[PDB]
Amino acid sequence: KPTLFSAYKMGKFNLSHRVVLAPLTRCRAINAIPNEALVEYYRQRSTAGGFLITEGTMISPSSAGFPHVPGIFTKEQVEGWKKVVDAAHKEGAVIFCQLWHVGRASHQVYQPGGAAPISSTSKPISKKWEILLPDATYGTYPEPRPLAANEILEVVEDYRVAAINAIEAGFDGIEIHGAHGYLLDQFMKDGINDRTDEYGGSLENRCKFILQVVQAVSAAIGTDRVGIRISPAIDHTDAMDSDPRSLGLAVIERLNKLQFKLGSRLAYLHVTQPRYTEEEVAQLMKTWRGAYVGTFICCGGYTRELGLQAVAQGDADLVAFGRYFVSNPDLVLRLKLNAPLNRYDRATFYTHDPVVGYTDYPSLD
Numbered sequence: 001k002p003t004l005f006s007a008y009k010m011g012k013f014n015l016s017h018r019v020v021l022a023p024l025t026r027c028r029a030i031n032a033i034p035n036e037a038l039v040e041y042y043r044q045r046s047t048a049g050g051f052l053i054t055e056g057t058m059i060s061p062s063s064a065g066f067p068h069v070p071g072i073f074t075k076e077q078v079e080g081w082k083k084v085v086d087a088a089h090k091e092g093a094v095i096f097c098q099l100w101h102v103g104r105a106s107h108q109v110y111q112p113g114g115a116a117p118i119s120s121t122s123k124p125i126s127k128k129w130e131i132l133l134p135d136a137t138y139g140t141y142p143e144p145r146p147l148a149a150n151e152i153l154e155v156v157e158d159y160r161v162a163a164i165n166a167i168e169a170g171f172d173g174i175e176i177h178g179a180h181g182y183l184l185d186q187f188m189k190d191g192i193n194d195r196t197d198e199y200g201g202s203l204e205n206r207c208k209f210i211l212q213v214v215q216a217v218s219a220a221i222g223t224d225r226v227g228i229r230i231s232p233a234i235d236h237t238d239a240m241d242s243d244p245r246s247l248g249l250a251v252i253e254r255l256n257k258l259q260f261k262l263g264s265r266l267a268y269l270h271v272t273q274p275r276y277t278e279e280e281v282a283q284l285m286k287t288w289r290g291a292y293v294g295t296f297i298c299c300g301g302y303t304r305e306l307g308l309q310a311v312a313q314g315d316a317d318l319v320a321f322g323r324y325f326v327s328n329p330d331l332v333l334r335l336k337l338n339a340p341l342n343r344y345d346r347a348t349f350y351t352h353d354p355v356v357g358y359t360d361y362p363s364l365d
């Protein structure tokens with residue numbers, strides 16, 4: 001009988017419990033190289049048969065939209081990741097690298113040559129949102145440059161290469177970051193995508209880019225090593241869709257069709273709970289899970305009780321935790337014990353110290 005703490009076969013991989021480390025950007029990978037701080041951070045959070053998803057990891061120089069986030073497009077970066085992955089595996093973890101391109105959610109200071117960030121559109125994120133800059137001030141999101149069709153294929157290739165590099169580093173698989181208003185979401189969401197070509201308009205056209213990515217990374221490393229993350233019901237950085245239910249089902253129908261065509265299942269579908277800044281929200285997530293053929297990871301506001309309930313009721317197979325994992329390196333143990341959870345200090349979510357607010361939250365002895 002499925003519970004939050006029971007084993008699960010995630011296709012190729014065996015898990016011993018259903019508690020997942022959600023992907024969390026933390027900005028400790030100085031100059032984009034995974035380092036000793038990241039090794040300790042993921043090692044602290046590793047459990048035997050526990051699934052870990054890394055922080056968003058750059059697939060290219062133009063991918064950058066936060067300071068000191070890791071990449072996986074150079075040999076130096078891959079060598080850094082090897083040390084992280086080896087340590088996690090020594091603890092018996094299964095670990096996926098999240099492949100991340102921010103699209104228009106960037107700034108000239110992050111872009112090679114100070115070029116404009118790339119996107120589906122020329123429309124910037126509106127001024128009511130600001131971007132954290134490398135000098136600890138907040139700046140304005142600039143006007144992005146809309147990709148030409150040939151250029152989109154180049155980014156698909158960047159994803160493909162990043163997936164190969166992740167496997168070279170020893171990762172068990174990768175997660176495609178298709179959520180939270182970043183590049184792939186800038187194509188999916190009709191509040192952003194104003195294109196009139198083959199990548200704009202219909203749900204078919206809007207889902208084209210992310211499906212090309214899923215197809216490319218699956219070709220590179222296998223369907224069973226690929227997860228995909230989406231967030232159809234949000235408004236973060238103006239990433240709204242007029243019909244989140246249908247958008248989510250459109251992605252899911254295409255994932256299902258691809259699985260049927262290729263003859264195998266993706267590792268999982270990962271969806272974050274609707275959020276704009278409640279029971280319809282609950283039902284939406286159940287509708288999406290019900291439609292997807294395969295493993296479903298839920299995330300967003302889950303607690304010990306909500307997580308137990310999600311797995312017991314069949315609403316999800318795995319439950320991811322973000323903010324609680326920041327402050328509770330041994331979150332799985334704490335959940336198993338119903339121990340109090342350490343409060344997290346949001347002030348150090350995105351600072352760059354390898355210890356302070358990163359690896360110095362205590363575990364239980």
Ligand SMILES: NC(=O)C1=CN([C@@H]2O[C@H](COP(=O)(O)OP(=O)(O)OC[C@H]3O[C@@H](n4cnc5c(N)ncnc54)[C@H](OP(=O)(O)O)[C@@H]3O)[C@@H](O)[C@H]2O)CCC1
Nearest residue numbers: 024025056100177179180182236275277300301323346349
């Ligand atoms: N994909 C990526 O690379 C990352 C996407 N992330 C997502 O972007 C959005 C904005 O992130 P943020 O860190 O700038 O702000 P946020 O997490 O939304 O928190 C802002 C305020 O909302 C509050 N809030 C009340 N409900 C909640 C709730 N369900 N969840 C996240 N906060 C909440 C939250 O309370 P806490 O400090 O977490 O207790 C805080 O007061 C979030 O949806 C986040 O999940 C952040 C950065 C990079």
Ligand SMILES: Cc1cc2nc3c(=O)[nH]c(=O)nc-3n(C[C@H](O)[C@H](O)[C@H](O)COP(=O)(O)O)c2cc1C
Nearest residue numbers: 022023024025055056299300301302321322323349
């Ligand atoms: C500091 C911080 C960094 C995050 N980084 C990522 C990220 O790199 N990729 C991603 O898909 N989501 C990211 N998220 C969203 C989280 O994965 C997660 O969905 C969110 O924290 C909600 O789950 P929770 O209620 O358990 O915190 C981040 C969230 C926070 C607070």
